[PDB]
Amino acid sequence: LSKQSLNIPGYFLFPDGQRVSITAKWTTLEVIPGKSTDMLVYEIDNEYNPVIFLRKGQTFSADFVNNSGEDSIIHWHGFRAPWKSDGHPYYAVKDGETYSYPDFTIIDRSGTYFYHPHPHGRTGYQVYYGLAGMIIIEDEDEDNLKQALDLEYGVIDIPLIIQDKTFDSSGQLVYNPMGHMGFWGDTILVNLTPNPYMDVERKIYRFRILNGSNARPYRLALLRGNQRMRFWVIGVEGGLLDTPKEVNEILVAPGERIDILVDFRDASVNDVIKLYNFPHNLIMADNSEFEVMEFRVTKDSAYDKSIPQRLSEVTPINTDGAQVQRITLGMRRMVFTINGETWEDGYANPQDINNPKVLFEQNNGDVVIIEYVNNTGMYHPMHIHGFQFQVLERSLGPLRATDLGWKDTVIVAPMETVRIAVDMSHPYNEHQIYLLHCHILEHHDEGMMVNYRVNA
Ligand SMILES: [Cu+2]
Ligand SMILES: [Cu+2]
Ligand SMILES: [Cu+2]
Ligand SMILES: [Cu+2]
Ligand SMILES: [O]
Structure with a gap:
């Protein structure tokens, strides 16, 4: 094609x-x-x-x-x-x-x-x-960034909803998730576009990368001939980071969203820059490398804006005296578990949906350190509803740029422990029932999902 x-x-x-x-x-x-x-x-x-x-x-x-x-x-x-x-x-x-x-x-x-x-x-x-x-x-922070860089949706503020899908001969979708490995598509799409290109000018572009795949994580780089081009992480799921973080690759799992700035003034007119996926190394399921998208620097520009020093205020969560909640990811005979339980273990059909089974309960305003412990052979992008969190620590290595800021989906690699901090403060006058689940959609569908509760 x-x-x-x-x-x-x-x-x-x-x-x-x-x-x-x-x-x-x-x-x-x-x-x-x-x-x-x-x-x-x-x-x-x-x-x-x-x-x-x-x-x-x-x-x-x-x-x-x-x-x-x-x-x-x-x-x-x-x-x-x-x-x-x-x-x-x-x-x-x-x-x-x-x-x-x-x-x-x-x-x-x-x-x-x-x-x-x-x-x-x-x-x-x-x-x-x-x-x-x-x-x-x-909000006001986005306003100042939009002015600093002359951003405009569809011009230089571009969504990149990355998805993998499989098509039969007649152009119909094929959905055959194999067992409990999640679904992995043969064809890569951006905004439902197969094998896409976009013409760009020598300007700063903002790309809002959203992994809308069922299970496939991406390790994305920008290739300009031999070298990897630089770019900056400026935001994650819970909004802007404090300052831009210069990187040459980003790992994005299903449910994650990474906002990046790419300065195509680094490139010359007639350059082609390949948005490329490298092996994700998070241990049907595929670990191959392939081009996601091609950028063609077709026009020069008088663009003179600078990437700002500061983007927003990310207040660190005070974790002193916080409660710890250890969330162990296991598997029980080819069924992934959360603290030994699946959705079908009392959560699925509550006698009272206003007071269902919850894995754990917190009071409004509690600071909680959640400790994901992945004892399985597969990675899991773990998502909580209701609040964003800040990633404290990974047992396997340092935090990555995509781990910073306010997150709502954290990658937990095989045999890895990750510690996050959640300020569970809400302005509502009733208790809250929020989900905690893996964001590999098949895992979630086959029961890797529980409730937790935050009181009024
Ligand atoms: Cu989601
Ligand atoms: Cu999972
Ligand atoms: Cu969600
Ligand atoms: Cu959800
Ligand atoms: O979700």
Whole structure:
């Protein structure tokens, strides 16, 4: 297949306190030119899977209309929300039904967020078939960065939703996760574009990289001929870092989002820069290297902006006297466990969904150190709902640039221990039921998921 121009998703300015219908439905998309692929899409204002824009402090009034053919619910991945507005599997609605999310205030920092379905056992299916979209929150820090660099969505502020998928001869998607290894696609897509290219100018570009794959992690570099080009991590799932972090590669797992700045003024006109995936070395399942995307520096520019010294304030969590919660990732006869338990171990069908089984319980305002201990042969990108966290320590090596800042998904390599810090402070007048689960969608679907509770 010839190189294809990178698709840039549409955008939707989500109004403040005004109800918006988000409809999941079956349709046909032309991913490969000349072929119709049956896929699911979120429809918002006659746009398919648009980039949703939010302003920090606004009211978020969403109704999920489910025409997907099965139970479903939208999860606002990374949001601090009341849990009945968060998209918990208990609240999934049947086909033809609507879930009205109670109003809540956007209180998260500016950055790149993620909306996708969260139904029990079918999240891998629905995400893979097309229910996935990016959210961009804006605050005053994003305003100053946008001015410093003259950023503009679709111009030099570019989403890169990276996904791997497999197509049959007729252009239909093939979803055959092998056992408990997660799904691994044969074809790499960016914003549902196979083998993509994008023309760039000699300017600074911001790329919001979102791993929307079911299981595949990426180790991404920018190759300019022989050498690896430099670039800067500026943000993670929970928003901007304190300062830019210069790197020459980033590791991004499913559920992670990495915001980077790339200064194509490093390159000459007519250069081609390959966004390349190297072996991820996190021990169907594939560890190969391959090009993700090609950038063509086609035009010169008078761009004279500088990468700023400071991006935002990331306040470190005070961990003195914090409670420790050890979360051991095991496997029980080809079934991955969390502290010896799966979702099917009392969590799946609560007698009272307002007071279900929880793995552990905390009081509002508790600082907790969570200690993931991976005793399995596979990596797990572990995600908690309700709060962002700060990565304290990895037993296998130093923190990586992508480990900094406010995170909500941390890579836990085979036989690795990772310590994170969570300030579980929420402004709600009711107790909260939040998920803790692996973000390899098949793992999550086959039960690597529990509740935890934070009281009022
Ligand atoms: Cu998610
Ligand atoms: Cu999530
Ligand atoms: Cu997992
Ligand atoms: Cu989740
Ligand atoms: O999630």
